[PDB]
Ligand binder design. Structure first.
Ligand SMILES: CCCCCCCCCCCCCCCCCC(=O)OC[C@H](COP(=O)([O-])OCC(O)COP(=O)([O-])OC[C@@H](COC(=O)CCCCCCCCCCCCCCCCC)OC(=O)CCCCCCCCCCCCCCCCC)OC(=O)CCCCCCCCCCCCCCCCC
Ligand SMILES: CCCCCCCCCCCCCCCCCC(=O)OC[C@H](COP(=O)([O-])OCC(O)COP(=O)([O-])OC[C@@H](COC(=O)CCCCCCCCCCCCCCCCC)OC(=O)CCCCCCCCCCCCCCCCC)OC(=O)CCCCCCCCCCCCCCCCC
Ligand SMILES: CCCCCCCCCCCCCCCCCC(=O)OC[C@H](COP(=O)([O-])OCC(O)COP(=O)([O-])OC[C@@H](COC(=O)CCCCCCCCCCCCCCCCC)OC(=O)CCCCCCCCCCCCCCCCC)OC(=O)CCCCCCCCCCCCCCCCC
Ligand SMILES: CCCCCCCCCCCCCCCCCC(=O)OC[C@H](COP(=O)(O)OCCN)OC(=O)CCCCCCCCCCCCCCCCC
Ligand SMILES: CCCCCCCCCCCCCCCCCC(=O)OC[C@H](COP(=O)(O)OCCN)OC(=O)CCCCCCCCCCCCCCCCC
Ligand SMILES: CCCCCCCCCCCC(=O)OC[C@H](COP(=O)(O)OCC[N+](C)(C)C)OC(=O)CCCCCCCCCCC
Ligand SMILES: CCCCCCCCCCCC(=O)OC[C@H](COP(=O)(O)OCC[N+](C)(C)C)OC(=O)CCCCCCCCCCC
Ligand SMILES: CCCCCCCCCCCC(=O)OC[C@H](COP(=O)(O)OCC[N+](C)(C)C)OC(=O)CCCCCCCCCCC
Ligand SMILES: CCCCCCCCCCCC(=O)OC[C@H](COP(=O)(O)OCC[N+](C)(C)C)OC(=O)CCCCCCCCCCC
Ligand SMILES: CCCCCCCCCCCC(=O)OC[C@H](COP(=O)(O)OCC[N+](C)(C)C)OC(=O)CCCCCCCCCCC
Lengths: 71, 93, 192, 353, 78, 105, 183, 161, 149
């Protein structure tokens, strides 16, 4: 049994995943070519969490009861 | 599943008939490499008068082939791709 | 130590039950009714609720009878096993064992019986089940296979003892008895 | 050149074989997204995408290219680890599961006696990659969806694993190719029709497809774990989810419909008798034929994924847990005892050959 | 007493019906699972009425003839 | 007596025979003490780790260094890459240095 | 079985890298005191095709070589060299007779095995022709021990499991004998 | 270059600087993956796959418990460490990776000799099952007993009723 | 009324599978047959005139250890892991071209480098305590001392 062909496939899968990130990164127009609202870091109104329009309590680190924990 | 049993029986007996000729060839290979081990040991430790070339097992009536070797030439040391600039296996380049 | 004659170092499950004495059945009944009876005694010794006697509910007596029924059989199984092992007096069981083996030998049948198991599994089964009755109080394990590892030599069945002349069993040599190890590996030494 | 050019192709030949293997799977996944909308459209008495490319053949290309041209939303450029690690784990898991799928006899990248275990083990990693999106996230819809993913995983994982083990038990092998070739005289749909339903029900729950789409329930959790995902992280998760639909459809065809075996042995011989076996063209046609049989069976179950979405409403996940633990598990563990008993009674315990 | 809960040891048949009507996921899973050992108990019938068990596979290595080495064998000598 | 040292195909492995001869020696009733079975114990342990045999190879390599012997002139030829187990290295009549196929058997 | 071992080639070159595997040769021949013998030169498919004829011709020598191994009591590979050389010559004799008497029938069968994953069930038609040719010219009959002669799988009229793909050469060669021999 | 050494170097760095409980449940997965791959490529592919099949199901259950117990404590807390003390610690650790001191056992390479006697050739899992279900069947039945106790144990701990 | 427009994506999906199978079945089978022709490139690529029709070898599956020994044995005869030869006698070079893999037997890297997994009472003893290796060095020393007798 020889798995050298399988090794090459696994290598390709790992590289192929990084291609989607890279290609999207090199293809998007720079923000200055767009409305030019600056880098995404400053635009906190965009990077904030989605709550259907209205902000709410930031409960990210509060514990969540789980009703199926026994199962 | 009842034919698979018969198909397995045919395969098992086919391998049984080839087993002696395949093992006889394998037995000669092990014996050939066994003498090559003790010949290499005899050459390296010849000038040591007290050294005895023998196996490491006390039971002398059981054949224990050696399982270690001393490494020599690296044949594919200068290899590229699709071609190994293979060094001479039999003697100096 | 008051040792006796070894009959079977690993008696089969059916042989142990068949060789039950009438007392072994008596103790089986005592175990079965001893568990509901102890529930009455414990209530009599000290009532579960309050200070007055109250009969335990029928559902408790149902599960108690089942627990006693299994306990009564395990006790009877170990009582009969000791006779096969020679730890307990087994004069009656030796005479019955000798008749059954000599009868089967004369028919050229295995005293142990034919098995679905191959030679490895017969050996493996005997390894798992032999002496397992010493832990029958903890968890169950029984010999329900026809293996040949019984700790006995079948040549001792070829000498007639006192009270066995009227049986008139003509015993063939062991190499003609079907399904025995000494009459199985005829062509190949690794196949029966 | 000449000689160097010719044997360089030999040096690169197997990489092209993998590239062709990757290309073939991505074409089915890309056009499954188109086929689902076309199938749902006509069942809903609409058309579905027919304006993007000739008769809608470029709709999948447009969706990918548009999403690949979108800004990625994240607090900082260095925060790629947060919302990209999850999509990659999910995508790498399903893609690696395709290494054991044989398009023909011996035509799998990985062949081993434990291909069944590799298949189940690889897909379990994808479940982990999904929950990573709700990594102490401040998005309550992503957090609510992560809880439901775990609840669904507990539901289907036992049933899906045990069903595949019964099929492996009937052939006494964990090699996927041996299971396919064991179905020459009978397709396991006939002896194990109950298990085919259970496998498909488990596949719907594994892929978070309706009626078990409780993870990405739009009417409940806007987009589930994808509510904060845009551009490339959204494509990768979407691509992996539809890759899993193709994988589970192909596994339904392998475990119960004979894999690549022909529908008609007579017709299969008739078609192949036209081509000389001493020519390479015979093996092209045979490769097309055998994969076509696998394609036809897998197309029907990819159709069935779309079909059940357009006919059945969604079931709450707490009901899914009771359904899998009180109904499916007792039935499957009954068959895992039923099947060896039948085979032993008729002296037909399976062996590998 | 139109729809009471049957007592198993008094009305075994009605007790079976209650669970087959109200808990099908329990009644029929057990019924399928019972068919396993029942078929294993019907195996002795098959060995007497349909066909016998197959001969065991030679899975114990090379079959060595149960005899002494032939000391008169010649041929293909050095 | 439970089975020990079972090979990957169900039968005895390489070192079972050494272990079996140790058990037979230790449990034989003809032995006053366990001294006769001491060499059998070392043989079994040598079958698994080969520690004394590896130690002998350590001495031979070291003794060859101090006398100036070339490692590549007294050792055994070897190949590290499986793709270059070529027909020229194997010694075939029409041998070649082109790589062998190991991608799919 | 694809288990990684230290006695043969493993699955991939990542296994060699982790183990730092060295593929070692030995240029020394067998010692001159041991008599020489020409090895068997057939590969996997011809050997499997010829397996039951080597068994029917070298049964005495195969058993004697194996019985030597049992009586060797651990000193196996040394004490059965002479018996092994008989086995090699007898097996080469069968392969020699195949290439002179049943060459086309023999090469047909193991070319089907190469075409069909080396599964005996996929190449019954070529095997039947080879069995008929060998029996007429070498008086060798394939027998599967332990079972009745009429329950041998290779003689089954209507097998349950049949090849999906047909070897075209075997189909042609089977038709030719049907119309010319069994009139 | 053995790239598994680099993987464990990164993992050891992230175990020293890990702060919250989510990072710990990631150190576990970042540990099983090097184990699974190294078992796959060197010693046992069967147990590489068994690890993936069993540990992943345990990991997700472990992850879901983190959601129900996360308690705000370590997001806003501060750690000091120091980059220099971290890297120096990892350098000193990397210096000594010889778990065994038998130099000959670690340096001299060995081989095994194949034989053709095993004509009934099956996978390691078939032999493991053959022994586990026949000779060590008691071990299997005790394991079944322990699994039953866990089922009862989990209920009597968690269930309020 | 069969909607043909809805069936178009299924036709492309069908052709997606056929692309993979058509390439894999033919490309792999051709390469195995090509490399089974001989031990060098001039025989693999060129086709002799006196040769007959090309017989193809299909890819192998469901193998065991015997097939690994067969593959290496075929390589020593033909230079291919699936070479073809029915000669009753091998070449002279087959007697001395055996391949013996020699490998280290060290514990996995994760065992001896993981920050947590490498710590245990017996692992510390094996790594930092010389009590075990002192005893085993006595056994090795007896081997050379006892040579003279
Ligand atoms: C037999 C029927 C029975 O078990 O009792 C009825 C019993 C009572 O049912 P019920 O209608 O709720 O009775 C109302 C009262 O609560 C019941 O109150 P109760 O006190 O009358 O019943 C409690 C019962 C205690 O019951 C048990 O201990 C169950 C034993 C199984 C272990 O105590 C007994 O009566 C002992 C005799 C009956 C059990 C005998 C079992 C022998 C071992 C086999 O039903 C069961 O316990 C069924 C459990 C077994 C389900 C099937 C498991 C399938 C396993 C094999 C599958 C493959 C084939
Ligand atoms: C913490 C966890 C701890 C673990 C706890 C788990 C507990 C496990 C322990 C359970 C037992 C351990 C062994 C399990 C492995 C069994 C595999 C095996 O033996 O297969 C070979 C065995 C066949 O091999 P064989 O060498 O040909 O032996 C044939 C007979 O079995 C043997 O010859 P025969 O004289 O017995 O003839 C059979 C026929 C005899 O019937 C007749 O023809 C009349 C002869 C006189 C019988 C009258 C007394 C009957 C007693 C009532 O009817 C029977 O006696 C049936 C035998 C079973 C009796 C009840 C079993 C007691 C279980 C409690 O397969 C079986 O059929 C065994 C019997 C049924 C299995 C019992 C399952 C119990 C659960
Ligand atoms: C072949 C069987 C059909 C046939 O003979 O010709 C009709 C069919 C064309 O349908 P049609 O001419 O509109 O039907 C006549 C009236 O227009 C149809 O007028 P209608 O709509 O008033 O007739 C209604 C008819 C529906 O029309 C049918 O009879 C279709 C038969 C459906 C069952 C078989 C599929 O009956 C039904 O509604 C039965 C539907 C319920 C069956 C549900 C499925 C049960 C399984 O001709 C073809 O078979 C070739 C066209 C198929 C597409 C080929 C190219 C596909 C593109 C792939 C990419 C390249
Ligand atoms: C308990 C009942 C066991 C007795 C039985 O029904 O079957 C026993 C039977 C053995 O008898 P026999 O057919 O003569 O075997 C030939 C031996 N050469 O044949 C058998 O051994 C069949 C196996 C019996 C297993 C019955 C199901 C076990 C119950 C599990 C709970
Ligand atoms: C497909 C690839 C997926 C992974 C790509 C992302 C690479 C990041 C590291 C992956 C694993 C390497 C080892 C990390 C172990 C876990 C330690 C950890 O806390 O995660 C590191 C990550 C970085 O956060 P950072 O800002 O650098 O440090 C905190 C500063 N106060 O802090 C985080 O919490 C982010 C973690 C995101 C979720 C990762 C879940 C683990 C996935 C592991 C799969 C691969 C297994 C490991 C292989 C490499 C081994 C070193
Ligand atoms: C499939 C679709 C392929 C075509 C669409 C993508 C076009 C990429 C080239 C491009 O965008 O060229 C425009 C660019 C720069 O202009 P920008 O707008 O800042 O580019 C944004 C690119 N970043 C993200 C790398 C900054 O110039 C070049 O460097 C020419 C090459
Ligand atoms: C897939 C192969 C079929 C191509 C479909 C096609 O050529 O599509 C036609 C295209 C796209 O224009 P559209 O408006 O989307 O066409 C849809 C027509 N409708 C609206 C009626 C449905 O038009 C063109 O020629 C413009 C582009 C130049 C040709 C390059 C096409 C892209 C090549 C990438 C894939 C090979
Ligand atoms: C349920 C419907 C499918 C079905 O009945 O599919 C099973 C049947 C019958 O095929 P089979 O007896 O399982 O063996 C398969 C035999 N081939 C190889 C000739 C298909 O396939 C068809 O008739 C299609
Ligand atoms: C022994 C032979 C085994 C048969 C094999 C199949 C087993 C299936 C079991 C179903 C039981 C069931 O539907 O269960 C219903 C449960 C819970 O329902 P409930 O709350 O108990 O109400 C019903 C109880 N009544 C009616 C007695 C009061 O949830 C469901 O609605 C599950 C819906 C599953 C639909 C999935 C779609 C799959 C489409 C497949 C297209 C190819
Ligand atoms: C079937 C058939 O003849 O397949 C011809 C094929 C594909 O046909 P299809 O209808 O797209 O197959 C889809 C299969 N379903 C309809 C079951 C989903 O078409 C060509 O490539 C020509």
């Amino acid at each position: 049994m020889l798995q050298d062909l399988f090794n090459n496939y696994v290598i390709l899968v790992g590289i192929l995943g990084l291609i989607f990130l890279g290609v999207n990164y090199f293809i998007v127009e720079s923000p200055r070519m767009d409305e030019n609202n600056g880098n995404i870091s400053d635009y906190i109104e965009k990077s904030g969490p989605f709550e259907c329009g209205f902000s709410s309590f930031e409960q990210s680190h509060n514990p969540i009861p789980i009703a199926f924990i026994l199962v | 599943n009842r034919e698979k049993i018969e198909l397995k029986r045919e395969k098992l007996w086919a391998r049984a008939h080839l087993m002696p000729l395949l093992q006889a060839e394998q037995d000669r290979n092990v014996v050939r490499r066994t003498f090559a081990y003790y010949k290499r040991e005899g050459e390296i430790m010849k000038d040591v008068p007290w050294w005895e070339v023998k196996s490491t097992y006390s039971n002398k009536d059981i054949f224990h082939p050696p399982q270690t070797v001393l490494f020599g030439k690296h044949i594919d040391r200068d290899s590229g791709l699709m071609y190994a600039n293979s060094r001479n296996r039999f003697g100096p380049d | 130590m008051e040792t006796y004659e070894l009959i079977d170092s690993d008696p089969k499950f059916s042989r142990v039950v068949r060789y039950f004495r009438p007392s072994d059945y008596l103790t089986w009944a005592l175990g079965t009714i001893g568990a509901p009876g102890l529930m009455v005694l414990f209530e009599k010794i000290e009532p579960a609720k309050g200070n007055t006697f109250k009969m335990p509910p029928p559902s408790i007596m149902r599960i108690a009878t089942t627990i006693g029924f299994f306990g009564g059989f395990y006790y009877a199984y170990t009582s009969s096993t000791k006779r096969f092992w020679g730890y307990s007096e087994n004069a009656k069981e030796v005479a019955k064992d000798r008749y059954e083996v000599k009868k089967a030998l004369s028919e050229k049948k295995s005293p142990y019986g034919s098995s679905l198991l191959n030679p490895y599994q017969q050996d493996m089964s005997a390894r798992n089940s032999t002496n397992s009755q010493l832990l029958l109080a903890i968890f169950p394990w029984f010999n329900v296979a026809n293996h040949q590892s019984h700790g006995i030599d079948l040549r001792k069945y070829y000498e007639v003892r006192d009270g066995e002349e009227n049986w008139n069993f003509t015993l063939p040599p062991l190499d003609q008895v079907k399904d025995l190890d000494v009459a199985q590996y005829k062509e190949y030494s690794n196949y029966p | 050149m000449l000689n160097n050019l010719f044997d360089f192709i030999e040096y690169i030949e197997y990489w092209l074989i993998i590239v062709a293997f990757v290309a073939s799977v991505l074409i089915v996944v890309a056009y499954l997204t188109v086929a689902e909308r076309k199938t749902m459209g006509y069942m809903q008495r609409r058309l579905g995408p027919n304006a993007v490319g000739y008769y809608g053949v470029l709709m999948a290309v447009a969706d990918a290219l548009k999403l690949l041209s979108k800004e990625i939303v994240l607090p900082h450029n260095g925060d790629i680890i947060y919302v990209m690690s999850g999509p990659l784990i999910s995508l790498f898991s399903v893609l690696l599961s395709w290494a054991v799928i044989p398009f023909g006899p011996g035509l799998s990248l990985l062949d081993s006696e434990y291909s069944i275990i590799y298949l189940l083990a690889s897909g379990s990693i994808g479940v982990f990659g999904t929950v990573i999106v709700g990594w102490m996230s401040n998005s309550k819809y992503t957090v609510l969806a992560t809880v439901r993913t775990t609840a669904q995983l507990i539901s289907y994982e036992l049933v899906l694993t045990t069903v595949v083990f019964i099929i492996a038990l009937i052939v006494s092998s964990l090699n996927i190719n041996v299971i396919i070739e064991s179905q020459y005289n009978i397709w396991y749909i006939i002896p194990f029709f109950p298990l085919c339903l259970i496998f498909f029900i488990s596949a719907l729950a594994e892929t978070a497809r309706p009626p078990f789409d409780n993870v990405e329930a739009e009417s409940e959790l806007v987009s589930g774990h994808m509510t904060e995902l845009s551009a490339s992280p959204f494509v990768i998760f979407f691509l992996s989810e539809y890759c899993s639909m193709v994988l589970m459809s192909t596994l339904t065809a392998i475990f119960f419909f004979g894999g690549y075996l022909p529908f008609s042995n007579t017709i299969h011989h008739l078609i192949l008798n036209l081509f000389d076996q001493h020519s390479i063209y015979y093996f092209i046609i045979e490769g097309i034929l055998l994969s076509g049989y696998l394609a036809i069976k897998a197309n029907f179950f990819m159709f069935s994924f779309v079909w059940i979405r357009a006919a059945a409403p969604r079931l709450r996940y707490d009901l899914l847990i009771l359904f899998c633990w009180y109904v499916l598990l007792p039935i499957v563990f009954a068959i895992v005892v039923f099947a060896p008993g039948i085979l032993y009674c008729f002296d037909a315990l399976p062996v590998i050959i | 007493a139109i729809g009471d809960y049957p007592v198993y040891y008094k009305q075994p048949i009605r007790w079976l019906s209650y669970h087959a009507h109200t808990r099908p996921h329990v009644f029929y899973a057990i019924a399928v699972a019972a068919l396993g050992p029942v078929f294993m108990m019907a195996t002795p019938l098959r060995r007497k009425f349909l066909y016998d068990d197959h001969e065991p596979l030679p899975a114990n290595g090379y079959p060595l003839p149960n005899r002494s080495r032939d000391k008169t064998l010649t041929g293909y000598d050095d | 007596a439970p089975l020990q040292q079972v090979g990957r195909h169900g039968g005895p492995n390489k070192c079972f025979g050494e272990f079996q001869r140790v058990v037979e020696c230790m449990t034989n009733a003809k032995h006053d003490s366990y001294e006769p079975c001491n060499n059998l114990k070392n043989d079994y342990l040598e079958c698994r780790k080969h520690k004394v045999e590896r130690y002998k190879a350590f001495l031979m390599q070291k003794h060859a260094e101090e006398l100036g012997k070339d490692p590549e002139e007294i050792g055994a030829p070897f190949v590290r890459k499986r793709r270059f187990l070529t027909s020229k290295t194997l010694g075939l009549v029409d041998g070649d240095d082109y790589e062998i196929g190991v991608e799919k058997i | 079985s694809s288990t990684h071992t230290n006695d043969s080639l493993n699955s991939s070159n990542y296994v060699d890298k982790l183990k730092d595997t060295h593929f070692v040769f030995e240029n020394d021949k067998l010692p001159s005191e041991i008599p020489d013998v020409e090895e068997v030169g057939a590969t996997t498919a011809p050997l499997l095709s010829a397996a039951y004829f080597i068994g029917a011709k070298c049964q005495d020598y195969n058993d004697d070589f194996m019985l030597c191994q049992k009586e060797a009591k651990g000193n196996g590979p040394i004490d059965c060299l002479k018996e092994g050389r008989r086995v090699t010559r007898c097996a080469s004799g069968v392969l020699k007779d195949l290439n002179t008497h049943c060459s086309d029938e023999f090469r047909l069968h193991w070319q089907c095995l190469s075409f069909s994953n080396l599964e005996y069930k996929n190449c019954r038609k070529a095997e039947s022709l080879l069995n008929k040719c060998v029996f007429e010219k070498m008086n060798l009959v394939k027998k599967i021990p332990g079972i009745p002669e009429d329950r041998q799988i290779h003689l089954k009229q209507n097998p349950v499991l049949k090849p999906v793909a047909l070897h075209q050469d075997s189909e042609v060669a089977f038709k030719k004998a049907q119309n010319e021999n069994s009139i | 270059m053995n790239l598994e050494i680099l993987d464990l170097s990164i993992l050891g760095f992230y175990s020293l600087i890990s702060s919250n409980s989510f990072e710990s449940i990631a150190i576990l997965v970042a540990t099983i993956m090097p184990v699974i791959t190294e078992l796959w490529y060197n010693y046992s592919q069967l147990f590489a796959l068994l690890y993936t099949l069993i540990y992943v199901g345990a990991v997700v259950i472990l992850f879901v418990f983190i959601l129900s117990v996360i308690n705000e404590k370590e997001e806003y807390e501060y750690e000091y460490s120091g980059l220099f003390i971290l890297i120096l610690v990892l350098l000193l650790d990397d210096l000594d990776d010889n778990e065994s001191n038998d130099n000959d056992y670690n340096n001299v390479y060995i081989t095994d000799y194949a034989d053709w006697f095993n004509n009934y050739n099956e996978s390691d899992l078939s032999v493991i099952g053959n022994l586990l279900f026949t000779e060590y069947a008691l071990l299997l039945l005790i394991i079944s007993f322990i699994l039953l106790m866990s089922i009862i144990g989990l209920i009597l701990i968690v269930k309020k009723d | 009324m069969i909607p043909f427009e809805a069936l178009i994506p299924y036709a492309i999906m069908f052709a997606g599978f056929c692309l993979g199978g058509g390439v894999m079945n033919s490309a792999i089978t051709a390469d195995i047959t090509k490399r089974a022709r001989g031990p060098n490139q001039e025989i693999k690529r060129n086709v002799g005139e006196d040769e007959g029709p090309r017989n193809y070898t299909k890819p192998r599956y469901n193998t065991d250890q015997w097939d690994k020994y067969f593959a290496v044995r075929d390589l020593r005869l033909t230079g291919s892991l699936r070479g073809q030869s029915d000669n009753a006698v091998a070449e002279e070079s087959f007697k001395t071209n055996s391949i013996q893999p020699y490998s280290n037997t060290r514990r996995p890297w994760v065992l001896r480098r993981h920050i947590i997994m490498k710590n245990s009472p017996t692992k510390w003893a094996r790594k930092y305590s010389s009590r075990r290796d002192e005893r085993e060095q006595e056994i090795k020393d007896d081997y050379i001392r006892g040579m003279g007798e």
